[PDB]
Design an enzyme around this catalytic site. Structure first.
Site, PDB file in Angstrom:
ATOM      1  N   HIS A  84      -6.121  -5.341 -12.565  1.00  0.00           N
ATOM      2  CA  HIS A  84      -5.165  -4.642 -11.371  1.00  0.00           C
ATOM      3  C   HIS A  84      -5.564  -5.143 -10.175  1.00  0.00           C
ATOM      4  O   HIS A  84      -4.589  -5.805  -9.345  1.00  0.00           O
ATOM      5  CB  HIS A  84      -5.149  -3.286 -11.612  1.00  0.00           C
ATOM      6  CG  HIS A  84      -4.406  -2.702 -10.197  1.00  0.00           C
ATOM      7  ND1 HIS A  84      -5.001  -1.484  -9.626  1.00  0.00           N
ATOM      8  CD2 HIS A  84      -3.319  -2.886  -9.952  1.00  0.00           C
ATOM      9  CE1 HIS A  84      -4.019  -1.327  -8.844  1.00  0.00           C
ATOM     10  NE2 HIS A  84      -2.967  -1.854  -8.953  1.00  0.00           N
ATOM     11  N   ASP A 144       4.118   1.800  11.748  1.00  0.00           N
ATOM     12  CA  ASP A 144       4.902   1.857  10.507  1.00  0.00           C
ATOM     13  C   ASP A 144       6.009   0.778  10.294  1.00  0.00           C
ATOM     14  O   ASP A 144       6.556   0.601  11.175  1.00  0.00           O
ATOM     15  CB  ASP A 144       5.739   3.030  10.010  1.00  0.00           C
ATOM     16  CG  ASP A 144       5.328   3.628   8.688  1.00  0.00           C
ATOM     17  OD1 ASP A 144       5.167   2.710   7.807  1.00  0.00           O
ATOM     18  OD2 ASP A 144       5.696   4.627   8.310  1.00  0.00           O
ATOM     19  N   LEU A 145       5.898   0.031   9.444  1.00  0.00           N
ATOM     20  CA  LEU A 145       6.595  -1.113   8.987  1.00  0.00           C
ATOM     21  C   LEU A 145       7.607  -0.916   7.683  1.00  0.00           C
ATOM     22  O   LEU A 145       8.226  -2.033   7.271  1.00  0.00           O
ATOM     23  CB  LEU A 145       5.961  -2.483   8.871  1.00  0.00           C
ATOM     24  CG  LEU A 145       5.639  -3.266  10.131  1.00  0.00           C
ATOM     25  CD1 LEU A 145       4.647  -2.327  10.977  1.00  0.00           C
ATOM     26  CD2 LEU A 145       4.646  -4.470   9.486  1.00  0.00           C
TER      27      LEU A 145
END
Lengths: 467, 467, 467, 467
Positions: free
Chosen positions: C235, C393-394
């Protein structure tokens, strides 16, 4: 150390008698082939080793100082006569090869030097008959690799259903392999040319392949294909892949051909508004063949639309080459014999020298004389600030001998792959179909000239600055 | 066309008779000076033109072919005898210029060839009496420009209160003006060296100034200043500015000196842990001066800790040069004469050549044998991907003549400014105060060596990869 | 239309009843599956649809409003009782599939949810009998994919001899597919983050995967594999590939997995000096399981050196990532649940804010609370030039539902490839062999802590600046 | 301490009573002025403190809560009645200032709020009489700073012969000083926006300054100047300098104005083919002033071609900004009030999202509603690789109060310099001379519209991509 066999399929052909036999001659003379190497010439006409020697020696460039070496070479030669689509001939050939010094254990190398209409049959028979169960088997496939995407796919699918990629060696006669390695070492081992090898610095890329001779004699064979299929889709486009590739994970053949096919995947289909087609015409002021045009050859059908010159602008649509033109300018019957990679860099951002600066250039010339030089500007000696354009140089079996040496050595880097070939044909197939459907008349240009001026106009339009 | 006057202050001094009169001789002989140029020597002792001739001709390097031109030249010169700190003498000299052909309208050019202890009086007297009301006035100030920030500040304040920056020409004897123009044209007119001229590509910068001789005879004068003030504070720092400067708005002198002072403004004060100081000692192997050390000179005070060698690492903390070392390695009695600019580039990101590549280098050698060459790897001729390091070259009055011609022509680009000089001492003043306060012992090195190995250790520590 | 069959190999297993039945139930409930879909359970124990219902209803998390739709979903279910290594059982399963509406023409999808030792027989039996001659056939393979390079290569060679890469779907339960698409769009559709995504700007890369719980119950099964094989090998390394990939030729699955494999090929083997291994021990205070350590679990073999935490630094030695650390930090029984990609950028070249600037960061958090935010410096409101750190924040079925939807739609982008898995195991194989040969003792750390301090020391050593 | 005196030259004018007295009110009310601050009004009309109170209180915008502090602010005020061109009046003013608490030791700060035709005499009289021999002296100069290069050079040379640059404070009412600092910290403290701030990434720069109202009554004063001299020569060009400047050596005012003037030196003169000029016309559908055109104003001379709108494209020909347009769009009576900086970035090199991506933008809006946001593409939530454009925000006395506070504090960063003004006028002088010579007719546009369509056509021509 291991014994090898060099298998010349269609050894009686013109190509086999003029370019391959001399090229194994020069390779064995220089001591480059493995010591235990046998040459088996196979064709339809019944011949002997003496007949092959008689018909091939003029092109051997033999010298009296090496008649003993020439006799040793021809003592390693053998001939088997049989049809290309007759199995009995193929088990006869296999029995002949087994009837040699360690023939069963020998590594077999097939060279298909015969017309492509029988590649299917020859490959089908070779797989069933003439394989070696100990050593490796490798076939050298000569161009043409079909004429469309469909035909190229069908031949490639047949061959890859029979062979694997490790056994297919599609040869490119015009690939120097030494200037290609010069390119790779220059742009991959140097930080000088690393960061500047992208959109931000390079303005245009010109890939040139000019020939000063027309299509004398063999005009009918060239008529059915045209200069695009002849040079541009394979050789110049492989040069484009070598120029535009990202750095491979290593110098392995597969790791390089992956970069080449990745570059090909970024090129879209060619639009006819970026293509200038030319056809050479006779020069009244010429002396020899110069006075005869393309249509003057009796083997060329009347009113032939085949173009002997073509300038094509391509665009690799990725982060490194988006918007940078790739002008593939190749043609026959031009003024000189040239084959080079030319990069024009952008004008310096902000000129403090009063528009005296010229675009930097990096030229990687392969023909006639190999050279790598940068056309950058240095200060003119004196008492005053002005740059002057200066040419600064940055830089032996020939290309074909070294390519056969790669086939012997197994370095498949300089040979076009199957996916690489499929992308190469995908780029050009719609334009070729349009050309052979609408039949637009090519722009005539005089023999020995620089080509149609519309090609120069297209180069100007795409962003190329010529002094 | 306009008439000029060349005033040699202290014409009886060694600097004058050994460097100046031969230089103006070579400028007049080559036909580079303006045709109406007058030379007026001035010193304390009573001399004439004949005495100047007798004391100067052996250093003229004249030939019998041009004895007529020599006679013409010495019929152009004149001498004035007077004290450097007497107003009457300066009035006499001003009248002496006025008693010449179109003397009052002539452009006056004063060269200060006399000890700096009296510049304060000499400049004052020149401004009071000897100034020209019609033609321009230009004074050439010879080093030393003070000993530290305070002395240089007071001297520069005095001169700038008297004259303006358009009239001050602080001359650098070691500045070629030939390789500096090569640097500017190379990095400002070419896109090859444009993007790579920054942190991301250049690993370290080496600025070298070596001399194969020591301080014979005149070692006492060198004792009071040391190699830092002698070479590194001014010449090597100007070379650092020229290498690290941003592209100026134009080729104007002011537009270049603004970039130079901007580069100086972002260099922190020198720390003692980035400095390696050495003192050359006798090489008992001898040969000539080599067997005499620095302290073996009777003119040198006993137990002198003056460094004749210095390696100093500077960091230009801006967007283009943050973290890139600037190693100023200068010294006396080293193995060879050399003055060069060397730029190591970073190793290529991602090595597909099995750790065979070495850092690319761009070398701009100023003297001896001016050259600009890059050490980049080409493909080794042969059969495989083998890179080998290759030196590729990319490239007339001497430097002093072309520098005096700058003062004649008004080109002030290669002369240090007042703010540039102030920034140069703010970078070296704390270190020098520490050196002459604590009085450390420099590492002794044998005559004719490459310097103390601690300098090599410093360069290796800061990131100089020496092969 | 185009009826589908979903064959859940191993219907009695815990993985099936606890995650797969709920996932397909939610897929149908949301109306995401095709209308004609059949679920065919197959296991060893003799069960029925009612037994499946009673065993799996606690985990569907159903509501009384949609009980009719739940009945509809269970009306499309079936069960076949057969051994995993019995050809007659697979024949009767194939007959049962054919005994359905349009069954022979249906698309078959086998979910292999059974212990790793049995794949060898199950894949062979499925390829022999249960294949579909009309519709497509796809297999979903659960981890582990072997224990090292040899075992993984054996299993992959077997499956690839049976199936092709278009049919192999190696599932990753931890892959969000929602923040991965956000990452790809952010770094490929924007010029803001395009140029800055390389060595010159990014200082180090932190890929994190933390769990707040230990190894309750499932402890001996965790013992034989370790946190490396469980999380970091697959992962976290796929996240590394997604972060470090070049822009693919297109958004196609193969074009993306090719870039992922090329990224993996540029990573050298992991060295034991770049690895910090930890093993959680019982927190004395605690509240619950925190009091129980890794060895306190009775099913864990005594004296186990299995690491439940690992911090590993990887280097992608290519042009874009040469020298940039890739810190993989995964662990169990840590302080918080987290799975995020963190990109620290370099310090600004030239600080004019008096060292008040912190390294810019880009964080793409996958869980919990999926978010994409960057930490850059904004000016603190007032009258001063004082920058301050700010978070900007994007920036819906869960990851597993969208992953099974990918297998239904054929989107193979988010599944590891055979060569991708081979490279992934090549990177970690020597380190794992050394770990289970020399048997080092992992650093014990408190349950619920942040991991061993040596991991923080390793990040500080490799160039991670923690504020 | 350090008592301060605030001299309002021309306190009886509209500018003083409408903008300056309320500004010092708001500065002392917020406790931002130094405690020992004296306000001295000086004009021709015989006035008193009570009369200034009566005429200015309606614009004070005070509250009954602070009516007590109102007298305290008015207890620090004083008035002197004298002519601007009489030495006796200025001597009286100097005596009056000396007749204050520590008036001789006080810091004197003069605000020139009087017509520019009198500045020449006013500055001379201040320098002759009212200068301070102990504290610093600072003069604030109001626009216009001349009409062209010649007049501006005359005025600037006069002021520089009188005062030094440390004493000259040329005020810009439209400079926020709050969003400029935000821009500096954004592009100088972050590497997210650092490397992308050049030619390679930014496509075009749009500098906007719109007003929803036209010339209300003072059309005659605006007629002689035009919108170019009004806003574009000073405010928009300073915004251009702030956006395009290199990183200064420090946050010092001198180091920032050096970069600003360096950027100005790299701008060529404006050509008439890059200019669109407009004149607003009354709108029949309007309600108030929208129904009255520019020529409908009786104070505007008949047949006036004064431009109330201007769209001008500039080019900073340097290394960072070569070929990047800088579109200065300003106008009066437009559709909305706005003053923002917009940077369009280039299209991403290589589109893998099927022509869906839009150019990234960085918008720094100064007025109204200060904000900084990037329009960058994020993935649209769902089951697809389709990006969507999103606006992501990256983000107290007003601008004038902070500017006066800068004057008091000595922060000269946000005031135009002598050479800055020289370059600013050099850029626009040829264009303005051509406009006033040929007298072109501006394109009429409707009151309250977006401006002439020719401006939009020019923006599209120069490389602005509008969606």
């Amino acid at each position: 150390s291991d014994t090898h066999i060099f298998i010349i399929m269609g050894a009686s052909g013109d190509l086999a008698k003029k370019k391959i036999y001399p090229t194994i001659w020069w390779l064995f003379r220089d001591g480059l082939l493995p010591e235990n190497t046998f040459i088996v010439g196979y064709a339809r006409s019944r011949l002997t080793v003496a007949d092959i020697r008689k018909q091939s020696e003029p092109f051997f460039k033999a010298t009296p100082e090496e008649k003993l070496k020439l006799e040793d070479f021809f003592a390693r030669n053998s001939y088997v006569a049989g049809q290309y689509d007759d199995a009995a001939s193929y088990q006869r050939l296999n029995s002949h090869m087994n009837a040699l010094h360690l023939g069963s254990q020998a590594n077999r190398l097939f060279y298909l030097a015969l017309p492509p209409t029988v590649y299917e049959a020859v490959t089908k028979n070779i797989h069933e008959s003439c394989m070696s169960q100990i050593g490796w088997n490798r076939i050298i496939v000569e161009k043409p690799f079909g004429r469309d995407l469909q035909s190229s796919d069908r031949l490639s699918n047949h061959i890859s259903s029979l062979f694997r990629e490790d056994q297919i060696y599609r040869i490119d006669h015009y690939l120097g392999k030494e200037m290609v390695q010069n390119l790779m070492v220059l742009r991959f081992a140097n930080r000088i040319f690393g960061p500047i090898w992208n959109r931000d610095n390079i303005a245009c890329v010109i890939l040139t392949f000019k020939e000063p001779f027309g299509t004398e004699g063999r005009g009918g064979y060239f008529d059915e294909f045209g200069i695009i299929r002849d040079v541009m889709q394979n050789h110049l486009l492989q040069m484009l892949c070598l120029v535009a590739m990202e750095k491979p994970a290593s110098t392995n053949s597969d790791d390089v051909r992956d970069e080449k096919v990745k570059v090909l995947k970024c090129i879209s289909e060619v639009q006819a508004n970026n293509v200038v087609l030319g056809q050479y015409v006779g020069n009244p002021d010429g002396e020899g063949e110069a006075t005869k045009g393309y249509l003057d050859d009796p083997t060329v059908p009347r009113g032939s639309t085949t173009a002997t010159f073509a300038a094509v602008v391509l665009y690799v649509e990725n982060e490194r080459w988006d918007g940078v033109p790739f002008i593939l300018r190749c043609g026959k019957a031009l003024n000189e014999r040239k084959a080079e990679v030319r990069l024009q860099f952008h004008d310096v951002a902000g000129d403090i020298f009063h528009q005296q600066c010229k675009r930097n250039e990096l030229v990687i010339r392969v023909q006639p004389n190999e050279a790598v030089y940068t056309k950058m500007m240095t200060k003119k000696p004196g008492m005053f600030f002005n740059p002057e354009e200066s040419e600064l140089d940055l830089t032996l079996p020939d290309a074909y001998e070294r390519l056969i040496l790669d086939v012997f050595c197994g370095s498949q880097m300089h040979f076009v792959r199957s996916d690489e070939l499929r992308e190469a044909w995908r780029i050009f197939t719609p334009l070729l179909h349009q050309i052979e459907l609408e039949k637009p008349k090519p722009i005539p240009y005089i023999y020995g000239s620089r080509g149609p001026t519309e090609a120069d106009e297209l180069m100007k339009r795409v962003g190329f600055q010529y002094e």
